[PDB]
Amino acid sequence: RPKLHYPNGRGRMESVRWVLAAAGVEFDEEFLETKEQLYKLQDGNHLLFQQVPMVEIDGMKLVQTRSILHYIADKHNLFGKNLKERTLIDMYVEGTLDLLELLIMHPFLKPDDQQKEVVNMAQKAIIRYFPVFEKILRGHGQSFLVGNQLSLADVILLQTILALEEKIPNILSAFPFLQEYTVKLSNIPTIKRFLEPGSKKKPPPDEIYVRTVYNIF
Amino acid sequence: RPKLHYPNGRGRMESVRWVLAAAGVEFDEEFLETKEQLYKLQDGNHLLFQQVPMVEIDGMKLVQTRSILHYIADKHNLFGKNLKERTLIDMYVEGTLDLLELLIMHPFLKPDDQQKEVVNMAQKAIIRYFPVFEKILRGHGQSFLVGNQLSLADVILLQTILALEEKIPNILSAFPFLQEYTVKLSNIPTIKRFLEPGSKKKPPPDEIYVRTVYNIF
Ligand SMILES: N[C@@H](CCC(=O)N[C@@H](CSCc1ccccc1I)C(=O)NCC(=O)O)C(=O)O
Ligand SMILES: N[C@@H](CCC(=O)N[C@@H](CSCc1ccccc1I)C(=O)NCC(=O)O)C(=O)O
């Protein structure tokens, strides 16, 4: 059963929770609360590069969010069925992570800038990302971005869209395909559960998480 | 023959040049010089996400540096021989790209901060990265990080180390394994050529490149 090392909050680890959950995998979490716990982790050489996320799985201690995500995907049929697919999924995912980053950085912005930022996510989403996906979907009519099966691309996208909606609730207004897609995906049982109460899905970060992260790093 | 879209300079594209070169692949380049050329590129829908790098290869227009690198690696035996390997290479690479980023951002810093920054790269390299690799190498005695064959991890690492050395010439002083490794790698013929004159290898960015990039973005 995988073990997740990270502070108790979303940050960069959330994607990993999403994927694991979606793949139907149960896992554990070991929260960081202080510099010191981080040191111990570091000290025992558990963090290849001294950072988290780190996830212990299949006897390894993987680090680097993307690397971790690829591993899981590949262990769980979330990476396509061939190079072509794999290639698409990869790109989609990277592009998406670039959008998600805005959300990740958000809480650490200066309150003043926080607002300008939301506007920016809105614009990027609307203009740079949503349209690509909307068209993809519109173009093949399937419920998945790639290969008519769930992929890592769909989870990250789903994760991101929902996160955005938390700040800009109507962000999908003009993306009817994306709206439907979201809906369905969210009805996938593992996902449906993850979205339900008592999942390891984390809440949007608060003043505390923020404080804490600062305290550990 | 691949076609590289990017300004005429290193930026994020350099890794791609390195890999292609190393893999012995010849390619072309289409330089961006103005906002306008970027617009046209964008306008014709050639940039999946409206950004570069974009590389046209095997009939696709790939975007996202990492995604691009994985594609090439996978088309050229630079991604290991199995999941285990692939997994290592992946991590190494991501960690390395995190270091390289410092170099990428450098020129756009405020001159004052530029210096503090160099010191920082030095420290990170010394403390967080070099040691991992040095030990890996020291631990198996091979000339490659993984699988006793060239991998994407070795190229990125090589690229990075050399770039650092351009600013901190003795950065490898305490990494005798890394020094040797570097030397040998640099003697790989494709690499040896890339390093020689008349390669598509780019120079460290100047006031111009800097200016230009700003002008296009
Ligand atoms: N590229 C890596 C980077 C991971 C990383 O940056 N980890 C940091 C925390 S990022 C905190 C952060 C930073 C910027 C924005 C959001 C967030 I959350 C860490 O473990 N640092 C330990 C150390 O350096 O001692 C990844 O995606 O896994
Ligand atoms: N994660 C992507 C991002 C690529 C990217 O940021 N591309 C930018 C230039 S980065 C410029 C930059 C920015 C920060 C530091 C170094 C560098 I070079 C682009 O095409 N922008 C076009 C647009 O947005 O209109 C990658 O690695 O491919």
UniProtKB/Swiss-Prot annotation, chains A, B:
GO CC annotations, alphabetized: cytosol
Family annotation (Gene3D superfamilies): 1.20.1050.10, Glutaredoxin (3.40.30.10)
InterPro entries in the cross-refs: Glutathione-S-Trfase_C-like, Glutathione-S-Trfase_C_sf, Glutathione_S-Trfase, Glutathione_S-Trfase_N, GST_alpha, GST_C, GST_superfamily, Thioredoxin-like_sf
Primary residence: cytoplasm
GO molecular function annotations of the record: glutathione transferase activity; identical protein binding; protein homodimerization activity
Effect of mutating residue 6 to F: Reduces catalytic activity 70-fold
Record domain GST C-terminal: where: 82-205
Keyword match Magnesium: no
Positions of substrate binding: 209
Binding residues for glutathione: 6, 51-52, 64-65
Domain GST N-terminal: 1-80
Family: Belongs to the GST superfamily. Alpha family.
Role this protein plays: Conjugation of reduced glutathione to a wide number of exogenous and endogenous hydrophobic electrophiles. This isozyme has a high catalytic efficiency with 4-hydroxyalkenals such as 4-hydroxynonenal (4-HNE).
PANTHER family xref list: GLUTATHIONE S-TRANSFERASE, GLUTATHIONE S-TRANSFERASE A4
Quaternary assembly: Homodimer.
Protein name: Glutathione S-transferase A4
Source organism per UniProt: Homo sapiens
